[PDB]
Design a protein around this ligand. Structure first.
Ligand code: GTP
Ligand code: GDP
Ligand code: GDP
Ligand code: MG
Lengths: 430, 43, 610, 426, 427
């Protein structure tokens, strides 16, 4: 009865969601045909012919990637109209997804959301998968958030986006499209979770025993975090935390709502037999800087608030002992106005294994959602790129030639300046 | 007289998802790319 | 020791151009098959095979009197290749001609059995002229094709024993041999503005015109008297994929075989199709029998056809796998059928007459391991794309496909006795168990200790344990009930096979180190080691259901029959052209059927009654 | 469904393009008869990009073959791949240009474009969603530089909101085969910098250079010299027809590649180049292909990349491979060769990976290079004009057809401005 | 893990090196093609030290073939294992060096060094952890001496902290086959002393005297003398490719035998060398080999050890043996030869034992010696240059190409500088 609406836009969000929706089918015993041989109602809709269809929307202006799903393994599971394709891409331009091509198809995208949202008995919030560096993932994310917040006045918004890595970078107009999105998503989004591509390359190497990681390795592992953050709505446990609360106790101020995410234990098949999976060791792996999923150093900054999302065969006694060890450590530092920062959420379902994955069959798991002050180092890195590139007015004629004015370039730097100065004002102890 | 059955999807060798085979034989690497800080990769 | 008898031969190599040729006595037919060459009588179906050649043959040349047989071979870069002389009567090699580096592309015989001509491969691109009488004769090497693309097809004249021509990618040239000076003079023909790529050559009896088969579908005619192009192909309805095989009759006209499979009888000019028929796969060999009332067509999917000229009705003769045969299995309780799997193809045979009955085609992928279910209701097959599949026996319907089973594809697979479990082996080293349900296929446990491929899996009769053979050098017995190993066997050998003794106490393993070793399941120690072969490794090995005799096969093309206690060879059968991979003694101990890496299936008679 | 219009003018453009259709009909499995015969279904999924469906299951390429002389149309039609073209796309005049830019642009070239633009506009409507234009010509002649850049000026007055891919053979000093190359080269780059959005310049000496030491060929004929250009030309849009893990169309490049509106003269390359002797001894790995692309010997233009600073670089991959190693040594090469690239533009390289490598191979890579060393290609043409206009040589063949002398001074003036812009940023 | 890059410069080093790649291909079970055919898995589990793997399970060596004449380059390709190499490593000129030091270093070889270093550095960036280099040449001629020190000088400035393993055949007094031979050696020793970490001295008349007294060979052709040198070639690096009880890397051998920065010329050796007749009359023990280590016949140089003193001695063993017999036998021999070994250094002997012997022989060892008696090899070269330079004989060829008269006195002063350092540490 509890529902969630999933929106995918760009190439990253569709390609991650191909590895996200392969997990929900096997967890509930749903075939790729869409037929089983009430915990599934949060992600699937019952039809009178005994066929279950996902409640997710796939949008990309470029039609190359969605034609893979329509002709691939999952052609009979998705709804034929929930696969919305444009004609031409955005091509690393934010204006080509926000003013010219993002204007023609925005009425068909918002029409299907109203079709899905009417069937839901109780709607909780949105889960949106995209990337900050793309043209569609920055263009068609931005005006959709501008239009969704007008229609649905106060529903919760959770974004799982791909942050640009500090060194490993693919596109060339990356620092322009990163700044122009955060002028929109700062006030039309309530909690934005960040991951990058470099920090999951090495986690795939030191832990999974994989020398050459593809994108199929990354998108499967981000597919496991989303199934762990949702797990309280899906299964019963000792104490449940739902989507309404942990988006209100991780946002202390209206402008500082940018947390991190990590998953543990992340162990291959060979190493897991020898190693003893204990609750004290799993929660100690979460706080190590080498197990962060974003290339940043959490020791330099101080945590504001934290959340724990346990699973499987876990008791709440040794969890409280495990939290007590963390609070007595000296490397982990907290800001003075948050004496109570931890969350506890326990589910009774063990983690599942995918035939074809590279993770081992474990007995428990955990997810951590940490609000830190060490992300301000990451954005100060990228606004350094903006000032040095805009000093010579490079790549500006591709922007003004498709709809925006040049004055938006300066005023979007004013917003990331005021966002940056707010982090030092809150991290200072009183 | 031979009864013949046809797979509807003519798949390609290049569109196979999985782990990428190392250029060297799984028994011995021509160039030793060890795991960082000792060990062996799975193969 | 005694020679092990062979019952029947099935197999054919269709990749070579003009491989099928009929010997002029019109009662025998010779075709290439692997390293050796085989002769089949059409009427009496008696097999005779010729031993020679370093590697796989590539070209064939038959004299008009037929008293000499010549064939080439392929060899690695920088090493010479051998051309072998033969006789049709006593089947003995005369001399070795080992000049061209790399493979030989084509050969031809003079009409009066006086001269032979060759053509070097893409490494050399030379022409060497031979005379049979001295048995080792070199005329001269004029480098064949000059600048621009090389020549591929050489044929010799029909009436006179002097001139020959080479054709190729944009190259056609007419030579002229002078007997006293022993020299050949190049004379490059002029085609006007036409540049084409030829595949086949056919010469009229009167030596007036000889035809060419282009990749553009056009048929080119050129006369060597005038050294000018004479005709051009069809203005419309050109054949698809070019003309891969051409042939001309004695009276006139042409028999044209295209790369798509179209067989057309037509006469210049116009080249309009009078009587049409479509054959399976690309036609690469057209050969007449007698005066041309009846003839044979050899395709590149090894489908040899028998076509009557008077009405154009085709009759399929022989089929095999054009790629290497990977596996063989016999159904429980019978021996009149067996299924052989290879690349892109799965087949079902009839043992008594070697007649195919079913073809299940999954394109562009290779099927490594095949196993049957004990009830006989689903045929389990491993594949290279990582997906285990299962097929129906009669209609070949795909019952279920299991996606993403292994990371580096499924290598070998075995089935349990009560038709409820499936155990697969893959190149990544994982061992996975698959519980079979009426609507679902599940995964229970993943057993990761191996770090190489899994060659073969053998299960017991009580289903309590199974054993896996690996190319690592570690052979492991698994406890299926509790899902953990008991004993490990270590050796300096890349294992290729393993079999259980019927009494179930002893297992034997063989591999690249060529030692057949006896092992104990109690502690994993080795007791007796026997050298099955001294040069080539042993791949296929199987034990009969009584525990008396076991056979071996390998790269040495040797079918040996052994005694379990004595450990000495009692029968030897030498009939293979390629490496052996899998062997299976039939239920009832009636036949020994063997597979080869060159696409041939051989059935031997079982010597003893045990 | 994102269709590309192919234009084919000049004598050099007709030979390369008719062999450019030789490769991309092999990759899609199209016979010289016209029918389709492939082994994979991914090739048939996007077949409308280069080909038009026709009755009988046969496909005809969407290309317009133009030359003022019929001396080469009888050669294209009488080749191995000449029976697939449409009989009505052969638009030809009767008298050749004769290596004059004035005949190709004002007298012969102003009377045939009404027959050329009538078919191009006719073929533009057969496309469902037009994506852009591509053209093959040579700057050193009379028809391709003469009429080809006349067609650039006329289509860009009709379809302004499009993209343009001119694939031009630049004149070379050591492989100079005409005495009027400095005249016909300076008269097209005044039109190319103003009405073309990406110009890939190709040189004749560098293509001979690659055949000598890389592939070890002693007879580099024209029948195989145009293959290397055709290989790179089919790698620019390998994501627009095939799937991949990171797709990139033609506008995906040009946003990343053009910081300033008239800095778009590129340089191409093709990565897996080996000999026949070293075929078996060669390791086909992703780290190996990366070293081959960034070498100075494997550039297809007569410039030394060490003498000028790279601005922005492409790297378009094909074949099954991991994105970590693609992103590893394309992070190192910015750091190791830090003086080569520029300091005010971070991430000078863009990586795009497809899923289908070409036939006869297991991987591929296509290199595209925007560098400031391309000015030395245009410096030698500029100094050839000064010593030739000083004595006013070969001018009566020009002023006897319609031009004055003021175009010659003006074309050198815009030659001086183009080379001036690159040196500021160096 | 630890890697060796091989270089073959000069005519003398090419046929020795082409015999070197034949010995180890037999030990590792590699066919002349490059496909593996071996018996045990210990052959392949360390093959990356000398080889590179190609696609399809083919192995190619890591060697770069260089010579100014292309006549001897085509002699290698027609050899037994000539087809294993790669054709991009084949760099050669067109004009001969004329056995002129100033032609292989200043005039004709000075244009090829751009082409040889771009392929030397190609195999090094593909490497992961480079240990050192291995160059085979000789000090008598003008091709392998003038160009040989040119390659060493240009590779240290790129890779400072490595080790060079040059394998130089030295001039012989009775076996002089060149008239400008004293001029060539003294010009190359000016660089090898300054910038090489290990140099082996191989003398031609020592190789002949072994072939007539120990092996009793009737016809000692050049095909067999290179086989004695190649046996010591493989014995040095056998602790880098095979497991052993007392492992010793190449830089392990650098610290042990080099006390001072200008004393690094070692006399090499081999151990189980016997004739055909005395196979059954000789009994295989480890105390056999120690009495065979210090035979004046068995060293590869014509410097008899009793006209000097020993600084450091090493002996790497191969096969199955215990260790007390290894180390007690190198304690008894120092006590017996007390005056010969130096007094200011105790425990003059470094030992090493491996687990894999060469094929066909149950047990083997390789001997390495550092002595002060090698000054006799260096005094006579300084004497032969002195008499020739007094009348300026054969000089108008060298002085006509760029390098003058005073450079000959510069190397002669450095040559006389070195032979005092052997003497001053002797007493
Ligand atoms: N981790 C991960 N990152 C991805 C994946 N797909 C794309 N990306 C990242 O997305 C970034 C750029 O955004 P894209 O998705 O490629 O471009 P886009 O959002 O589709 O914009 P358009 O191409 O114009 O439609 C690249 O730098 C990639 O790192 C994926 O499957 N997994
Ligand atoms: N590399 C190469 N260059 C060509 C080819 N065809 C022509 N050219 C060059 O084109 C130049 C002459 O241009 P041309 O074709 O006569 O132009 P046109 O007069 O307008 O037709 C010559 O310098 C040739 O080097 C070719 O197939 N390959
Ligand atoms: N061991 C060995 N020594 C050789 C061989 N050929 C020549 N030499 C020695 O090399 C010395 C001359 O060196 P030289 O060939 O002039 O050196 P280069 O200038 O590099 O060619 C002679 O004294 C010979 O003893 C050979 O095949 N084997
Ligand atoms: Mg996109």
């Amino acid at each position: 009865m509890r529902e969630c609406i999933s929106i995918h836009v760009g190439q990253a969000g569709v390609q991650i969601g191909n590895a996200c929706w392969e997990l929900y089918c096997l967890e509930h015993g749903i075939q790729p045909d869409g037929q089983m041989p009430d915990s599934f109602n949060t992600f699937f809709s019952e039809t009178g012919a005994g066929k279950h269809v996902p409640r997710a929307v796939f949008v990309d202006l470029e039609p190359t990637v969605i034609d893979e799903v329509r002709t691939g393994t999952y052609r009979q599971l998705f709804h034929p109209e929930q696969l919305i394709t444009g004609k031409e891409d955005a091509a690393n331009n934010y204006a080509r997804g926000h003013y010219t091509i993002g204007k023609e198809i925005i009425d068909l995208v918002l029409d299907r959301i109203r079709k899905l949202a009417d069937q839901c008995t109780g709607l909780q919030g949105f889960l949106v998968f995209h990337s900050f560096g793309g043209g569609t993932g920055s263009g068609f994310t931005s005006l959709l958030m501008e239009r969704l917040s007008v229609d649905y006045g106060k529903k919760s918004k959770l974004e799982f986006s791909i942050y640009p890595a500090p060194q490993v970078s693919t596109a060339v107009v990356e620092p322009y499209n990163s700044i122009l999105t955060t002028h929109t998503t700062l006030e039309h989004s309530d909690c934005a979770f960040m991951v990058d591509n470099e920090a999951i390359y090495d986690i795939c190497r030191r832990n999974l025993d994989i020398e050459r990681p593809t994108y199929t390795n990354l998108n499967r592992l981000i597919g496991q975090i989303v199934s762990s953050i949702t797990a309280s709505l899906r299964f019963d446990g000792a104490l449940n935390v739902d989507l309404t609360e942990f988006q209100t106790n991780l946002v202390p101020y209206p402008r500082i709502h940018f947390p991190l995410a990590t998953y543990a234990p992340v162990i291959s098949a060979e190493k897991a037999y020898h190693e003893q999976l204990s609750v004290a060791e799993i929660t100690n792996a979460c706080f190590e800087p080498a197990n962060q999923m974003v290339k940043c150093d959490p020791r330099h900054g101080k945590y504001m608030a934290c959340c724990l999302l346990y699973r499987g065969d876990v008791v709440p006694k040794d969890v409280n002992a495990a939290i007590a060890t963390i609070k007595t450590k000296r490397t982990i530092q907290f800001v003075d106005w948050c004496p109570t920062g931890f969350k506890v959420g326990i589910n009774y379902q063990p983690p599942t294994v995918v035939p074809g994955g590279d993770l081992a069959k474990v007995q428990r798991a955990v997810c951590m959602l940490s609000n830190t002050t060490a992300i301000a180092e990451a954005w100060a890195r990228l606004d350094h790129k903006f000032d040095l590139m805009y000093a010579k007015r490079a790549f500006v004629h591709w922007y003004v030639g498709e709809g925006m004015e040049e004055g938006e370039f300066s005023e979007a730097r004013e917003d990331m300046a005021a966002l940056e100065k707010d982090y030092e004002e809150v991290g200072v102890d009183s | 007289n031979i009864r013949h059955w046809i797979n509807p999807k003519k798949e390609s060798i290049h569109s196979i998802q999985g782990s990428i085979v190392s250029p060297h034989t799984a028994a011995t690497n021509g160039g030793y790319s060890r795991k960082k800080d000792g060990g062996f990769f799975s193969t | 020791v005694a020679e092990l008898e062979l019952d029947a031969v099935i197999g054919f190599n269709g990749h070579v151009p003009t491989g099928l040729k009929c010997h002029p006595d019109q009662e025998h037919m010779i075709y290439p098959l692997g390293c050796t060459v085989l002769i089949q009588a059409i009427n009496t179906k008696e097999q005779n095979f010729l031993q020679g050649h370093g590697n796989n043959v590539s070209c064939l040349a038959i004299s008009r009197s037929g008293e000499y047989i010549a064939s080439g071979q392929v060899t690695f870069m920088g090493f010479k290749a051998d051309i072998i002389l033969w006789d049709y009567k006593n089947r003995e090699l005369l001399a070795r001609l080992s000049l061209h580096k790399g493979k030989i592309e084509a050969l031809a015989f003079s009409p009066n059995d006086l001269y032979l001509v060759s053509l070097g491969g893409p490494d050399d691109g030379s022409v060497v002229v031979w005379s049979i009488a001295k048995r080792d004769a070199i005329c001269g090497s004029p480098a064949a094709g000059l600048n621009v693309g090389n020549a591929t097809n050489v044929i010799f004249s029909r009436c006179r024993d002097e001139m020959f021509m080479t054709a190729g990618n944009g190259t056609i040239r007419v030579w002229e041999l002078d007997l006293p000076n022993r020299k050949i003079w190049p004379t490059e023909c002029q085609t006007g503005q036409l540049k084409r790529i030829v595949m086949s050559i056919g010469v009229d009896d009167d030596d007036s015109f000889f035809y060419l088969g282009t990749t553009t579908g056009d048929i080119l005619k050129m006369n060597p008297r005038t050294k000018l192009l004479t005709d051009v192909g069809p203005a419309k309805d050109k054949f698809s994929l070019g003309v891969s095989a051409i042939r001309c009759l004695k009276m006139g006209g042409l028999l044209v075989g295209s790369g798509a499979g179209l067989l057309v009888f037509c006469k210049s000019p116009g080249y309009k199709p009078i009587k049409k028929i479509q054959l399976q796969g690309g036609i690469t060999s057209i050969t007449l029998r007698g005066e041309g009332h009846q003839f044979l067509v050899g395709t590149e999917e090894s489908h040899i056809y028998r076509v009557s000229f008077t009405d154009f009705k085709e009759t399929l003769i022989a089929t095999c796998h054009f790629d290497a045969v990977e596996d063989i299995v016999f159904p429980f309780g019978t021996a009149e059928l067996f299924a052989t799997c290879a690349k892109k193809d799965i087949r079902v045979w009839h043992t008594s007459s070697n007649r195919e009955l079913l073809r299940i085609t999954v394109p562009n992928m290779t099927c490594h391991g095949i196993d049957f279910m004990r009830d006989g209701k689903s045929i389990i097959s491993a594949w290279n794309d990582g997906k285990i599949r299962a097929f129906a026996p009669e209609t070949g319907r795909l019952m279920y496909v299991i996606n993403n089973a292994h990371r580096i594809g499924v290598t070998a697979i075995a089935t349990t006795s009560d038709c409820k479990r499936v155990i697969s082996g893959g190149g990544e080293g994982e061992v996975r168990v698959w519980q079979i349900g009426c609507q679902t296929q599940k995964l229970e446990e993943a057993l990761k200790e191996h770090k190489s491929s899994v060659s073969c899996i053998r299960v017991k009769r009580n289903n309590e344990e199974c054993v896996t053979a690996s190319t690592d050098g570690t052979c492991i017995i698994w406890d299926l009930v509790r899902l953990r190993r008991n004993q490990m066997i270590l050796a300096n050998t890349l294992f290729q096979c393993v079999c259980y003794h019927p009494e179930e106490f002893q297992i034997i393993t063989s591999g690249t180190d060529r030692k057949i070793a006896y092992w104990e399941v109690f502690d994993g120690t080795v007791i007796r080691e026997l050298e099955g072969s001294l040069s080539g490794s042993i791949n296929g090995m199987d034990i009969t259901q009584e525990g008396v005799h076991f056979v071996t096969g390998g790269n040495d093309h040797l079918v040996k029959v052994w005694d379990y206690n004595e450990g000495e060879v009692t029968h030897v059968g030498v009939g293979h052209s390629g490496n052996i991979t899998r062997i299976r003694i039939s239920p009832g101990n009636q036949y020994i059927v063997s597979v080869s890496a060159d696409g041939a299936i051989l059935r031997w008679k079982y010597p003893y009654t045990s | 469904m994102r269709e590309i219009v192919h234009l084919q003018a000049g004598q050099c453009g007709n030979q390369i393009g008719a062999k450019f259709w030789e490769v991309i009909s092999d990759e899609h499995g199209i016979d010289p008869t016209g029918t389709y015969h492939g082994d994979s279904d991914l090739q048939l999924e996007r077949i409308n990009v280069y080909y038009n469906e026709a009755t009988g299951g046969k496909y005809v390429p969407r290309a317009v073959l133009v030359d003022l002389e019929p001396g080469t149309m009888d050669s294209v039609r009488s080749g191995p791949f000449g029976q697939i073209f449409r009989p009505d796309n052969f638009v030809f005049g009767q008298s050749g240009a004769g290596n004059n830019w004035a005949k190709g642009h004002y007298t012969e070239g102003a009377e045939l474009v009404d027959s050329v633009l009538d078919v191009v506009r006719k073929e533009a409507e057969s496309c469902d969603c037009l994506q852009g234009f591509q053209l093959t010509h040579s700057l050193g002649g009379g028809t391709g530089s003469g009429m080809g850049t006349l067609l650039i000026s006329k289509i860009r007055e009709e379809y302004p909101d499009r993209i343009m891919n001119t694939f031009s053979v630049v004149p070379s000093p050591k492989v100079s085969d005409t005495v009027v190359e400095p005249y016909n080269a300076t008269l097209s780059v005044h039109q190319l910098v103003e009405n073309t959005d990406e110009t890939y310049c190709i040189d004749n000496e560098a293509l001979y250079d690659i055949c000598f030491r890389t592939l070890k060929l002693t007879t580099p004929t024209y029948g195989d010299l145009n293959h290397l250009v055709s290989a790179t030309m089919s790698g620019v849009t390998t994501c627009l027809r095939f799937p991949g893990q990171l797709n990139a169309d033609l506008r995906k490049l040009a946003v990343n590649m053009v910081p300033f509106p008239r800095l778009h003269f590129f340089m191409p390359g093709f990565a897996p180049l080996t000999s026949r002797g070293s075929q078996q001894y060669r390791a086909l790995t992703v780290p190996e292909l990366t070293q081959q692309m960034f070498d100075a010997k494997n550039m297809m233009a007569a410039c030394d990349p060490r003498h000028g600073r790279y601005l922005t670089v492409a790297a378009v991959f094909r074949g099954r491979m991991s994105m970590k190693e693609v992103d590893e040594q394309m992070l190192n090469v910015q750091n190791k060769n830090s003086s080569y690239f520029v300091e005010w533009i971070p991430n000078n390289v863009k990586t795009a990976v497809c899923d289908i490598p070409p036939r006869g191979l297991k991987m591929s890579a296509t290199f595209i290079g925007n560098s400031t060393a391309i000015q030395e290609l245009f410096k030698r043409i500029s100094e050839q004009f000064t010593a030739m206009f000083r004595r006013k040589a070969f001018l009566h063949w020009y002023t006897g057809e319609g031009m004055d002398e003021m175009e010659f001074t003006e074309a050198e003036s815009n030659m001086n401005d183009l080379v001036s812009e690159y040196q500021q940023y160096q």
